[PDB]
C-alpha cells in the first residue's frame, strides 16, 4: 500500500509518522525530526535553545512550511527528574524570554486573565465541583499579576526531553499562552516537588516564595484540575480518577 507522503526530499530517506504532523527521516546516521506547518514561533524556540535546533526550512509551492530539526537521542524526564536545577533554569529561561514574548504577541495572542478564564469554566457538576468554583470566585481578588510571560501550559514531565549530549528541552508548544508564570509554576511544584522544597526550588528558578505566589499558584492548579474534569464530560474513565486527585488537592488548600 502506498503511503500518502510524496511531497518530497530524496528517495533514499526512510520516512514514517512519529504529536501533530511528526515524521522521522533516516539516511546513513542522520535522523531528522520533520514537521508540516509549524508555527513561526519555532524559529525563536530554536534560537533560544528550548527545542532541538533547526536544520533547514523549505516553503512548499502550496505555501506549506516544512522544517527539519535535529532528531534528539535520549529519554523523557521522569517525575523524579522534575526537581533538578536544569528543569527550573529552563522554565525560568522561557518565562523571561522577551523574544518568545515578542513572537506570541506578533501572532495575536490574548493576555490570559483569570477573570475571563474563570468565566470559561462552564460546567454539570458534582458537589465537590460546586465548592471548587466557590474557592475560585472567592479568591479572584488575590490572583492578580501584571507581568505576563510566555507559558507552555502543559508542563507535564513527558514533554521534557534529555539528550545523551546533556541538553534539556521542552517540547509541544501549541498551548503556548501569554499568562501569569504561576500558571506553569503551580502545576509543576504541586505535582512533582515536596512542599518543604518549594522555596529552594524557586531559588534555583530565581523567584522568592512570596505570599501572592502561594495564592496564585494554588488558584491555577485548582483551576487546572477543574477544567480537566470538565473535559472528560464529552471520557467517563479518567473522569472518576481526576475527582480523587481533586479531593486531595482540596485538602491541601483548606
Ligand atoms: N526535534 C524533536 N522534537 C520533538 N520531539 C523529538 C525531537 N527529536 C526527538 N524527539 C522525540 O524523542 C523521542 C526519540 O528519542 P529516541 O532516543 O530515538 O527514542 P527512544 O524510544 O528513547 N530510543 P529508541 O526506541 O531506540 O528509538 C521520541 O519521543 C521523539 O518524538
Author numbering: 1 to 8, 12 to 21, 25 to 129, 136 to 246, 249 to 268
Give me lines lifted from the publication on this model:
CcrZ is a recently discovered cell cycle regulator that connects DNA replication initiation with cell division in pneumococci and may have a similar function in related bacteria. The CcrZ structure most closely resembles choline kinases, consisting of a bilobal structure with a cleft between the two lobes for binding ATP and substrate. Instead, CcrZ shows activity on D-ribose and 2-deoxy-D-ribose, indicating adaptation of the choline kinase fold in CcrZ to phosphorylate a novel substrate. We show that integrity of the kinase active site is required for ATPase activity in vitro and for function in vivo.
The structure of CcrZ-AMP-PNP was determined by single-wavelength anomalous diffraction using SelenoMet-CcrZ crystals at a resolution of 2.6 Å. Structural alignment of the CcrZ-AMP-PNP structure with LicA confirmed the conservation of an N-terminal lobe (aa 1–79 in CcrZ) containing the P-loop (22GGATG26 based on alignment with LicA) and other residues important for ATP-binding and kinase activity, and a C-terminal lobe (aa 80–268 in CcrZ) harboring the putative substrate-binding pocket. However, in contrast to LicA, the cleft between the N- and C-terminal lobes is wider in the CcrZ-AMP-PNP structure, which could provide insights into how choline kinase activity may be lost in CcrZ. Inspection of the AMP-PNP in the CcrZ structure revealed that the adenine base is sandwiched between hydrophobic/aromatic residues lining the bilobal cleft (F39 and W77 of the N-terminal lobe, and L173 and I183 of the C-terminal lobe) like the LicA-AMP-MES structure. However, in contrast to the nucleotide-bound LicA structure, the orientation of AMP-PNP is in the opposite orientation in the CcrZ structure. Instead of occupying the active site, the AMP-PNP moiety is rotated such that the sugar and phosphates are facing out of the active site despite the placement of the adenine base in its pocket within the enzyme. In agreement with a non-canonical AMP-PNP engagement in the kinase site of CcrZ, several P-loop residues of CcrZ remain unresolved in the electron density. We propose that our structure captures a state of the enzyme between its apo and substrate-bound forms. Almost all of the bulky side-chains that form the cage surrounding choline in LicA are replaced by smaller residues in the CcrZ structure. Specifically, LicA residues M28, Y197, W251, and Y268 are substituted in CcrZ by A24, G187, F240, and A256, respectively.
